[PDB]
Amino acid sequence: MSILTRWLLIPPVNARLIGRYRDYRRHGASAFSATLGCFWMILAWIFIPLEHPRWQRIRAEHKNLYPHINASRPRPLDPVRYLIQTCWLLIGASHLSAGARRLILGIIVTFSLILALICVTQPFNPLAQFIFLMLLWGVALIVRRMPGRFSALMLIVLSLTVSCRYIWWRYTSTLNWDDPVSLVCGLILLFAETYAWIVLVLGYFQVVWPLNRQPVPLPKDMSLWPSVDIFVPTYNEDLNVVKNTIYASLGIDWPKDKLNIWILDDGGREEFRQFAQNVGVKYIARTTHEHAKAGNINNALKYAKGEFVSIFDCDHVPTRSFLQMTMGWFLKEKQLAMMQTPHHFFSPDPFERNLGRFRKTPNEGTLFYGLVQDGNDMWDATFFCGSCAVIRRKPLDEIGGIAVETVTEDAHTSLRLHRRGYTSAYMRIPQAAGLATESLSAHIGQRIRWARGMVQIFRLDNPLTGKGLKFAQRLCYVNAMFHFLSGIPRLIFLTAPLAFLLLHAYIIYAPALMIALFVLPHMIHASLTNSKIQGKYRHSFWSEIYETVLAWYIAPPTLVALINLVEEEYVDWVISRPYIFLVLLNLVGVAVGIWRYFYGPPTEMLTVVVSMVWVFYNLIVLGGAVAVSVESKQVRRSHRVEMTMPAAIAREDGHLFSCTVQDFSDGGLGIKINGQAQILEGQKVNLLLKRGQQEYVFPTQVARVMGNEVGLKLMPLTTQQHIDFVQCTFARADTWALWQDSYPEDKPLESLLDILKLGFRGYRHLAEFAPSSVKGIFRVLTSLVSWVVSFIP
Amino acid sequence: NDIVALKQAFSLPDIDYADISQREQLAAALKRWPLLAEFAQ
Amino acid sequence: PWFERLWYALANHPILLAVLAAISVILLAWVLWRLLRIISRRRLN
Amino acid sequence: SSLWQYWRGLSGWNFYFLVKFGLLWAGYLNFHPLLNLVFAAFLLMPLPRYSLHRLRHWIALPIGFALFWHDTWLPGPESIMSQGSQVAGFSTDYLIDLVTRFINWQMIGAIFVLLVAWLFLSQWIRITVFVVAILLWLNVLTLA
Amino acid sequence: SSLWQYWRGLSGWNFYFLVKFGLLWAGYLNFHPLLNLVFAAFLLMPLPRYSLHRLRHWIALPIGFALFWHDTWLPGPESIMSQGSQVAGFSTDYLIDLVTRFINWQMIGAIFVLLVAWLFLSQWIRITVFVVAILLWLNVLTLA
């Protein structure tokens, strides 16, 4: 029958069709798909001039710029996608006297507050409110592009005016006093939002003015420098994690006559005793194990004799500049009794490891140790955070040592020191790096312990109502304690629209337009103000993910306390149960809402849309939370730190070649050689590292050669070689500061896109494994529709 | 050059760094080799 | 009714209220900036 | 073998057909679908040489001009040739005023907008096949 | 050329067309869809050289100014030229009162917020396609 085709169709087109059909048959594509593709091709080339060289040049780089379209994979409704993408592109764009000064301040402040009260309590019609919204939002946007602290204050005040307006409107004209069911839940949501507003106001106060304390130079004479004792308390950590801490301590740039390093062991392990004997540091193994780490430190204080005590965790390695950058203030302020240093984690956190964003997004704790403690510094409320700190022993002996009551002993002892009149200080430069939690369960547990301790301090010591303590200190401490009571409001927020969608209950009795015109400015201004203030500390919309991960596990213990090596990828079902339950509830709500959009009253058309967008936001948040709960592969014994240093390699025949170190770990290095000079996968190599102008040699064995990249494994080193290696790789006083300074800034829209992709990735992750089999089908359907829509944006 | 990197990164123009490790190594070297001790002092 | 009178005065004036709010924000920011500078200088000494 | 490059389309004459169709839609043209379809077939009919194609275009330019003139309601050129003496006998200022009054700027603006839209849509809309389809539809309407 | 990459868009004239559309919606305009469409086609006419593009913009600026003046309900140039001497000879108080009554702060605020929205859109959503579509819709509605 090929003769008929040859006669009817010109042979070039016939050959093209036959070849395309054969290619799609070999790839499994349907013959009907090939026929439809050819029909579209011919109808286009006759109804669309594809001969234009402009479109040919666009097609030349179309694959690189738009790799989401495949010419060899036809799909139903392809021309609709082409038209939609084309429409998106065409749419898209390609001094004075005291009394007079006080009176002037009084009049200015009262006038400004009267104007703010008028702005807050002015009823509007929707158009007037919208104009007000656009104007104030534009003012915020303009002030955003203005570096400094005055702009931060302006944004704080503007946000406070907007939030006070929102709360005033909610408390005046949203509570519907008609129903007994549309009242209790509405007031519950109102109380949740009032708590959130209070937390926001106290946080704005806390970081209103970071102090930016600077190190004070030490005296030139080395005989005036004070004696420092370093404590390293260990209970069950392996020696491989404390060795680097001890080696970095032995290399601290402090006079060895005035530096004693102690290893505290609550396990009575003989390996630690022998290690202490070999390296020359002290050792204490108490017979009675009471009060845990606080008791260990107290027993150590019973023997140590030094002016200052510096507490280090097992995994935290100090830089050599730590004592020189810290001790200056203790000799300047006689009242000082505590100094704090940031906590940095070179190990990838569970979020960073699982979600694949390690060096892109900032760490969870760099907002606290980067901005919050600096804010607490101004009000003299910088509390002990466990490690990377120095305490003067004379004040610490008066208070009876480290507090032993709560599980968070550091905050308690800092609170006692502040209540006895002593001050505290904070230094911003990261001078010690530790290991992050190895799993989501560990993060949940440590946060639970911290929250339990903070609630215990709130119930027992009660910073609000105690003894001599400044009001700013009270506010800072109560804000830190309230931060851990946010689980219940988060649960309310995640389960609020399900009320109306499931059981008709008007939580907010206002038209959807007015809700959009009042709630939205609050959120927009809060996001902008935080993005300016906590700029290189936390990306936008990420705090909700952490909050929702913690909420279900922090709310029960906090409430009770108020009353009284990944071999294979897997999903932590036990940890992820609450997220899956909330996803099921929200999606059954969205099914009911889809029903109500048609079979419900027509007047409730925008309200259902508002509830549905709320449910969609909830689902994105919970999907990100689930995405956290899948553990990525981890077979590296030691974690690697990406640092670029020039180096050199020495062979046994005496040839030296230059190389660039790209990453280092406890027992290896990774280097890059321009051309793969001379190295094989078992040869011994001497590695030359420079610390300033001094060069150090370390024996290595080659483990992997993959072209330019070479992996090296460290040979058994002596103690001095260990110290030198730590001083050349880990305890460098430039790695952590530049690490924190290299964090990208906060882009709210890009952050939203990343979080949406993360939620989609989490849904796809759960589309593979399923605890309750039934959920499998639903998850697969959701992922299917979601990627179909993504292909049709 | 770590201290130089810190100074270039975050202010710190008046904190003179006292490298006590280098001084202790130099003193031990002067004690160990009498030639260096003779020429230095 | 004085609050009613004040509201009716600016019932449909969003531009004027935006100007007043910006003025209040700038002035309160200046006062807070002065106070926080004073407290910061006293804090570092 | 690039034998397909002998059937290129009617790029350059698509504006002609579009203007004629617009005039027909506006009622200012006496349309002959059969003659237009014959002209389109002649234009789309290939010639062995590119120089022969240029010669065909040069021959069809007077043919296209004559067809456009005759499709309009203007009187035949023979009457103009006969009465040129009488026209010259009339005052020239009155003739200038009359020709300035006769020109309709609305149609000129519409023609300019159509030319711009044809130069732009020659990216997403191949005008040759659409013109052929519209001409076939008009021929079918006039036949049945 | 092969590409004709000269359809750069209306660029700043999107705000001009948006202002015209808003004034027409307010009801203060004697809109001319044909003249607006011709002006838009003139602005979107592809030109090879950038110097010709700049010259076209410079020439179109007073043309657009005159078209905007014509499409309004303000009196024509004859009245202005006849009453300029009287306006100059009038007292300052009457001129100040006339200026105050002529300026509407609501109109100024609407124009400013429209300009800000146009800036935001032109940063994210281009406006040439929307302006052309709106002009075509208005022309079709008026002609039909």
Ligand SMILES: Nc1nc2c(ncn2[C@@H]2O[C@@H]3COP(=O)(O)O[C@H]4[C@@H](O)[C@H](n5cnc6c(=O)[nH]c(N)nc65)O[C@@H]4COP(=O)(O)O[C@H]3[C@H]2O)c(=O)[nH]1
């Ligand atoms: N035999 C051997 N080969 C090594 C080693 N380190 C790197 N490679 C090789 O280099 C590739 C690039 O890995 P990367 O740059 O570390 O970037 C890695 C890393 O970011 C991540 N990754 C893979 N496995 C692990 C793991 O066990 N732990 C961690 N933390 N990340 C891992 O995935 C990326 C891609 O890794 P691959 O697809 O496996 O491809 C790896 C692998 O072929 C090593 O210690 N031993």
Ligand SMILES: Nc1nc2c(ncn2[C@@H]2O[C@@H]3COP(=O)(O)O[C@H]4[C@@H](O)[C@H](n5cnc6c(=O)[nH]c(N)nc65)O[C@@H]4COP(=O)(O)O[C@H]3[C@H]2O)c(=O)[nH]1
């Ligand atoms: N900084 C650095 N160190 C390197 C590199 N290559 C090897 N090492 C060091 O050499 C040790 C042995 O690695 P291996 O023999 O390839 O044997 C490796 C390899 O089989 C596997 N592995 C670890 N990470 C990766 C990875 O990213 N990708 C793959 N494909 N395998 C990995 O786990 C084994 C244990 O590796 P580790 O526990 O990391 O212990 C590693 C590490 O200390 C490198 O490119 N960079």
